Every structure is written in structure tokens, then in C-alpha cells.
């Protein structure tokens, strides 16, 4: 019937919706910093916008290694054991600090990068100051991600959105204290926003720890009672699970960087519309990612409960819901490609060219939604390895050469950005096609074999 499926589709949304608010208010910090740093110059607004382009991928690579804790914790809760739950958390933190060792190194190498980009000193001396101010937050951002990954793994999502929203609401007024040199605080024109970001991240971490200690819903775990110690044998287990998830993100970012370099030979009016279209296609990526995150915790719960039909129905309903939301937002983007391009910019040639790229951005949305929901469902099964192979093959072997063939080389008149966007679409379709096949192969296996694989 349909009274058995719908219940699941009521759970999933109830899990997926809060995460979205906790993920929208994460780019709000960068946006607010950039906007408030432009009310004092256009040198500052372009100095804290370069420094937010080296910070974000560097911290995403670090976060990617702590996203393998969600299935590990959610499966123990389903199996009903729960008394191994405090042991894994105390390991995750020991990992988080360690993965802040390389990042803080690479950020100190910021200078050698900007002089590689042909940047004048008048804003280099501001970008370096901003980066040195924000390095004090990667110890308190990765730990907060580990704690949030725990609370999500416990099928409890509320304490993330509230804390993120409070963080942003405390970021807005506390920039104006340190930017406009007020209340006996440094003038600090373009680095005050970095200092405000560090302070608000530390406050959010402290509030989350206070909630974890006091909450009456987690009291049956007794989390902060032991003083456990690291052990390499068990800790290498988490690294093997977590590495491919980070590798896929790294290769995706490098692909998006290389495409811009190949488009640079064209006019500076072409690259601006490409950047606008890509930025907007990255903003509306949050809905399928949130649905994937909800499916990931839901699928690992059923397999912990020694139930497999529950995992199958969870994955299928996740796919259907991701497809439906992709379709609705693609229609709402195609119907409204007038006002947003005018929100972004002012030149009418730039808007007249970006209206053409939004058409392909709609198909891009509709395809990557299915791709990412399938990837989340596969991550539910602790199969973190096949994702990397399949997405790397579908990105850098089919996605990239086909863009160049339809673009520069003038085979098959030359096409500009549109050839590259068609290359993106081909890569995404191939990735979705192979991940679906892998999921079906893994879903048509015996109960013992599938559980054993999910047990490891």
C-alpha cells in the first residue's frame, strides 16, 4: 500500500528540515563578513573575499574526515548497545585535533600563494591579517563539527539549528564593534571581521558542550564520565572510513578550479556570467545535501536494528524526495531567471549572457540532486570506498574532456561556456548512472552478506 511508505517520508522530512537551517546559516557568516567589510572600502571587501576562498575549501577537506562518524554512531544506537557510544566519541575528538595540524600549516603558507596570483601589497597586507586572525578558529570549528556529528548520529537534530542561528545573530552586531573601532576596541578595519568570526565560533562550541552536559535526553549515555586514551589500532579504522569522502570533495573543488582556468582565455565579460551562474548553482545545492544527510542517519539505524527492508525503503524514499525537490526548484529557477541576475550584478551585457547559463544550471540542479542522494544512501552502508572511484571516473575522465571537445577545440563552430556546462552535465549523468548500479547490486544481496558488509 502507501500507508507504510508515507510514515517514513514523514520521519525523513522531520529529520531533514532542521539541518537545512543549520546549513543556510553557515554561509551567512561569510556573506555577512563580506558585506560588512565593503562599507569601509572596496579594498577591504576584495581583501576578505580572497581570504574566504582559501579558508572554505581548506576547512571542508578537514570536515570531510569527520563525516564518517555519523553511520558509526547511528548504527550503535539502532543495535541498542549504546555503551560503546562514549568510546567512539572520545576517539573522534582525538582525530579532530590531529586533522587541524595540517590545515594550520597550509594557511601559514598563504603569502606564497597570493604572490602567485599577482596581487598588490595594499590588499595583501589585509588578506594576510584576516587569515592570521581566522586561523585561531580551526581548533574550535572541527571539534564543534564532531559534537554536531554525534548529536545528529543520535537521531537528534534540533541543537544544531538553534546554535547556528544564535551564532549568526551574534556575528552581525559584533562585527560593528571591531570594524568601526568602537567601545574601546581596535580600529582594525578589515581584520575585525576575522576576529569576530573566531570569537563567535568559540562561543558556539562552548554553548554546545553546555547543552550536551545538561540535556535530559542524552542522560542515558553518560558521555562525560570517562578519561579514555587514544589507541592507534582502533583509530586507523576511522581514517580508512573517512579518507575517500575527503578525496572526492578535493577532486571536485580542483575540477571547478581548472574549468575556470580554461575559461579564462575568453573575455572578461564571459567569465563574470560563468561565475554568477556557478555561485547560484552552488547556493541551491543545500536541499539535496540536507536530504542526503537525513537518509544517511536513517539507513544506518535500520541496519543496526537488524532490519533490511527498512533500509531499502529509507533509501528509496530518500531518492524520490530528492528528485521531487530538485524538480520544483529547477522550475522555480527557470521561471525566475530575471530578478536574481539583477540582484547579483548591474551590467546589462553580463545579465544578458547569464540568462543563457541559468538554463543549463537548472539541469545541473536536477541531476546532482539524484547523484548526491544516492551518494548519501551509499554512505549509510559504510561503503565509503566505491563512491570515490565512481565519482572520480565520472568527473575527470568523462566530465572534463567532453567539455573541452565541445568548447575550445571546435569539433563536432566553437562554443564558449555552454560546452563546459554540457561537460558538467555529462559527467553528472554518468556518475548518477554508476552509483545507481552500485546501490542496486548491493541491495540485491543476501541478508547475511549485506549485514556483514554493513557490520564492517
Amino acid at each position, epitope marked *: 500500500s502507501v500507508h507504510r511508505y508515507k510514515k517514513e517520508a514523514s520521519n525523513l522530512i522531520k529529520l531533514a528540515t532542521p539541518v537545512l537551517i543549520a546549513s543556510v546559516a553557515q554561509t551567512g557568516m561569510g556573506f555577512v563578513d563580506t558585506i560588512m567589510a*565593503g*562599507g*569601509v*572600502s*572596496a*579594498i577591504d*571587501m*576584495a581583501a576578505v*573575499s*580572497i581570504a574566504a*576562498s582559501i579558508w572554505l575549501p581548506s576547512i571542508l577537506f578537514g570536515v570531510g574526515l569527520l563525516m564518517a562518524l555519523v553511520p558509526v554512531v547511528a548504527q550503535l544506537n539502532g543495535a541498542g548497545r549504546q555503551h560503546k557510544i562514549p568510546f567512539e566519541v572520545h576517539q573522534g575528538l582525538i582525530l579532530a585535533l590531529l586533522v587541524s595540524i595540517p590545515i594550520i600549516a597550509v594557511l601559514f603558507q598563504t603569502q606564497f600563494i597570493i604572490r602567485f596570483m599577482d596581487v598588490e601589497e595594499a590588499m595583501a597586507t589585509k588578506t594576510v591579517g584576516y587569515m592570521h586572525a581566522v586561523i585561531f578558529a580551526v581548533p574550535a570549528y572541527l571539534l564543534f563539527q564532531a559534537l554536531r556529528s554525534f548529536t545528529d548520529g543520535m537521531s537528534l537534530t534540533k541543537p544544531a539549528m538553534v546554535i547556528g542561528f544564535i551564532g549568526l545573530l551574534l556575528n552581525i552586531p559584533l562585527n560593528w564593534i571591531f570594524v568601526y573601532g568602537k567601545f574601546g576596541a581596535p580600529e582594525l578595519g578589515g581584520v575585525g571581521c576575522g576576529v569576530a568570526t573566531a570569537i563567535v565560533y568559540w562561543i558556539m562550541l562552548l554553548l554546545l558542550l553546555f547543552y550536551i552536559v545538561t540535556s535530559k535526553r542524552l542522560a542515558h549515555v553518560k558521555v562525560f564520565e570517562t578519561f579514555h586514551k587514544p589507541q592507534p589500532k582502533e583509530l586507523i579504522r576511522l581514517f580508512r572510513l573517512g579518507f575517500p569522502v575527503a578525496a572526492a570533495l578535493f577532486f571536485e573543488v580542483t575540477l571547478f578550479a581548472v574549468v575556470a582556468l580554461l575559461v579564462a582565455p575568453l573575455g*572578461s565579460t564571459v567569465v*563574470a556570467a560563468h*561565475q*554568477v551562474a556557478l*555561485n*547560484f548553482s552552488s547556493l541551491v545545492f543545500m536541499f539535496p545535501m540536507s536530504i542526503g544527510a537525513a537518509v544517511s542517519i536513517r539507513v544506518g539505524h535500520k541496519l543496526g536494528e537488524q532490519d533490511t527492508k527498512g533500509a531499502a525503503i529509507a533509501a528509496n524514499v530518500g531518492l524520490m524526495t530528492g528528485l521531487a525537490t530538485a524538480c520544483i526548484t529547477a522550475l522555480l529557477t527557470v521561471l525566475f531567471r530575471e530578478q536574481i541576475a539583477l*540582484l*547579483y*550584478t*548591474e*551590467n*546589462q551585457v*553580463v545579465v544578458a549572457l547569464a540568462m543563457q547559463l541559468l538554463l543549463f544550471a537548472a539541469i545541473y540542479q536536477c541531476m546532482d540532486a539524484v547523484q548526491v542522494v544516492a551518494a548519501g544512501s551509499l554512505r549509510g552502508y559504510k561503503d565509503m570506498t566505491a563512491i570515490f572511484h565512481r565519482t572520480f571516473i565520472s568527473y575527470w575522465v568523462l566530465g572534463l574532456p567532453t567539455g573541452y571537445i565541445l568548447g575550445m577545440t571546435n569539433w563536432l563552430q566553437p562554443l564558449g561556456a555552454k560546452g563546459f556546462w554540457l561537460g558538467f552535465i555529462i559527467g553528472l549523468s554518468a556518475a548518477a548512472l554508476m552509483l545507481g548500479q552500485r546501490l542496486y547490486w548491493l541491495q540485491k544481496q543476501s541478508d547475511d552478506v549485506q549485514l556483514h558488509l554493513a557490520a564492517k
Partner: nanobody
Amino acid sequence: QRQLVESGGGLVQPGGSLRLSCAASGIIFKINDMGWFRQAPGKEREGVAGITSGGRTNYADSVKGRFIISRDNVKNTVYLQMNSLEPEDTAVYYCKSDGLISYAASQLSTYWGKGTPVTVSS
């Protein structure tokens, strides 16, 4: 040329005053720096004032006390009030604007003007 246009320059006796105005189109102007430049024959282009998106005017050394740069945001224009002119202020004055092209970019874009001549003599 098309983004920036200047107007208001003409002949004026020594000890007189002018008012140049630069009107910008196709530019956000809320997040842009501004500035005026001059170039006299035989010499080279050199800065003469500058305002940065919130104030903090940046006059030149041989210019302070006579030139007062201001900006107006409701109708996007930049002014420059010339006072106590002298025979050495004769040149063609340019307008310049730099800032982000859109809210999604990271590098600055610079646009020039065609210039308006000013000639001071008896």
C-alpha cells in the same frame, strides 16, 4: 567612456571656482572607490583626490585646502569643488572607479573616463 562621463569644465579666470561632476552607469557605486586624475601636456597622469565608499578623502599634497571631493549615492555621481584656481591647474581631468563587478567575484575591475578639459587664464 560608457560607464563614466564627466562634465562641467570650461575656461575660468585665475582666482575662480568650478564644479566638476562624474556620473556613473552600469556600476554598483555602493561598493566602489572613486577618484579624479589630471594630465597636462608634457607631464604625466597624477592623482588629485579620492574617496573610498564611506568617506576618508585622500587629497594630494599640492591640493589640500582648495579641492573638496564629495559623493552622492541616491543619484550616483561624484563631485569636485575647485577653489582659488591658479595658472598651474590647467589640464584635462579624468574620472576613475574600481570595485567588484558583481557580488560573486573576488578581483577588482577598473574603469576610466574620457576627460573634461579645464583651462585657467586671463
